[model samples]
Target chain A: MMQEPLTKERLISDWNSNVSVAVARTTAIAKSSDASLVQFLAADAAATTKSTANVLKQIEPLITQPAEREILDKIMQVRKTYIASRDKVSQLKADGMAEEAESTLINSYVPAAQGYLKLLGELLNLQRASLDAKAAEVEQIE
Target chain B: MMQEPLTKERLISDWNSNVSVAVARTTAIAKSSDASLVQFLAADAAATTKSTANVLKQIEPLITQPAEREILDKIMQVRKTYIASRDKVSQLKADGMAEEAESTLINSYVPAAQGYLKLLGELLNLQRASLDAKAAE
Candidate 1:
């Protein structure tokens, strides 16, 4: 069977699905007696959410092209869901349910980070490869 | 001045010092608001301490020469200090002072891991180089 070329759409779809599956697999948090620890994790998750969003904004300009833009937009939406989930985690901590808060960070944030990082890695590699190909083609013109 | 020959003693000494410095540099923990996270980190450090000691035991026989054995003994002593420190980390966690527990793990465990791994890397390289030299000779 002929192999289909990898495209931005397929990459984005695969990445999104991969992340979704991982998010769904979020397991119960490892329980701890320490309320402060619950608070720490909740706050950390919230901070991470904010920082991750900031990073997306900072890198927005670099995401050009129609296909790239489309995927970026989709990822932005996914991030909103993750951020909202993390907000609940913080609230859980504030409510003195450290166990739940810790659990949320482990299950939710871990997968979110994993999903985002994977996509970013693939996206970076794709762009670099495209640029290198262009450079090679330009060299051949001489 | 005559150049000194590369010997097992020197290799072992270098390895020990490299690891010792790293272990010493092992500082304090990453501050966290969650006591549970601190406890978790302490437990991890303690567990790591046990595993690292086991690794040392496994590799003991590999350091054959008397000179090498001397430095190896010193390194074992150094490891004891680290393990002791890490044990205190566990104690802190048990006390429910998660902040200190976390700090101990971050500072102590991170440095300990880096130190031992580097020592292992250098030791392996030294032995390989020693073998390659003999082959070249």
Candidate 2:
């Protein structure tokens, strides 16, 4: 979470690392018809979602400016799509159509996952800028 | 994910199962300062947030009435705090005071977590009632 003072390069690196997991999971689901895999993938979607809330909580205080908050809020609105994707996958799973569930992962879920990955990537960029600005201010106090 | 049609008991059970990961991660971090543990916790937090959004989305499409949408919106508004708690924890972690971070988590994060647990609980209750009212109509 705390890395070398946040840079865009670093932000993308971290985000890709995390998003890769989702991508891989989605890919795995797409290539298989295993109901158990679907269940695990569903569990994973739930966990990512819960974690998104927690991550936002952590980042909110780092955001000070009103404009930053507004941007963050906008990101949040877009972020809900990931949730919708999760719902799509779940409904497919409940219907016991493994192939259809996989299709949802490939068609809808992966894109949704990528979408939120970019949203959070942007979120971290703003957070980094805000944190660095604060850091620069502290440096000047010396 | 899709549960068995979103009943009162089912929602609570599903929420608990999901929320428990947060609780467990919080507890694990409290006992140690492994950076990997923190990373996992962060990952867990992100997943929970994403899932919360998904859960809300599922419920959203179910709404056919204004009251239901209003209730769902309230649930979402309350959902923002979980985001705040994550940001707070991150700021503290960056400060390098693990014990204080843990303390803040105990005093602040846990309550915020429970507060959300309750909010969602209330959300489901309201949603349940609203849906039922519509059902009776």
Candidate 3:
């Protein structure tokens, strides 16, 4: 079945907050009683966020094209929702409510994440495989 | 020349409040001036200190091995010194004395980091060149 191609405006409207989402995912602070771990996680996250934003900004123009728009939206939604929910769980764990957080995660977020991963993975894999196959075919001809 | 390593006892001994330094370096905390950054940094640093102490309780076997013992001691010293010095800088930053912290870092820690980097680069180049010479032969 053919789907409608995503327009630039549609993509932007759907995922203009990708920078924020990427930053949130990278820096989801855990208030665990661990200083070294905190140091490593925080620094690395900052570096990751900076790089992610840089890359995203670089390709932001391509995101306006109908050909590359849907993937951009999916990327933002999948990563943002998944990471934000996990951050909430981490916060709960930090606040001396690990059991509650675990319960909520097990009941709610984990399932959504699992489902999203399955659906998105299959879709992404097909496209990736097609792209790889096309590239390989081109290389063989060359 | 190799220096002495850190000990667990020394690490615990050098503890000070540098939540702000850790916080300022934090990605979540730095991305926005949201109160969440402040809260998380404060809590995470507190957690790190408590957790590091608890970890020392678990490793009796590692404490006495000469090499491990030396490293353990050095690690403790680093944590202690870092926390002690960092807390002071963080305090200065908190008091709107960012320039003071910057000066301290420039005059002190930056030099130490750069010196280590220079030594490391020199050592690594020697190792690589030695390998390359053997390859040439």
Index of the highest-DockQ prediction: 1
DockQ, candidate no. 3: 0.05
The Cα local distance difference test for each model comes to 0.48, 0.52, 0.43
Residue-level lDDT of model 1, residues B1-137, one tens digit each, is 10122233233433433343233222323233333444544543464356445555555666776644664565556566567766777678668787787777767765655555455545545554554345331
Give the range where candidate 3 chain A is weakest over 10 consecutive residues by summed lDDT: A1-10
In order of TM-score, best first, we have 1, 2, 3
Q: Rank the candidates by lDDT, best first.
A: 2, 1, 3
> Order of candidates by DockQ, top first?
1, 3, 2
For model 1, name the residue pairs that clash: A36-B34, A36-B35, A37-B34, A37-B35, B27-B107, B29-B103
Off by over 4 Å in 1: A1-58, A97-110, B1-137
lDDT (tens digit, per residue) of candidate 2 on B16-103: 3355445434433443444444543455468866764565445456555575466556645655765566567766777787667767
Q: TM-scores for all candidates?
A: 0.39, 0.36, 0.34
Which prediction has more favorable TM-score, 2 or 3? 2
lDDT of 3 at A120: 40
Q: DockQ for model 2? A: 0.02
lDDT of 2 at B66: 72
By TM-score, is 1 or 3 better?
A: 1
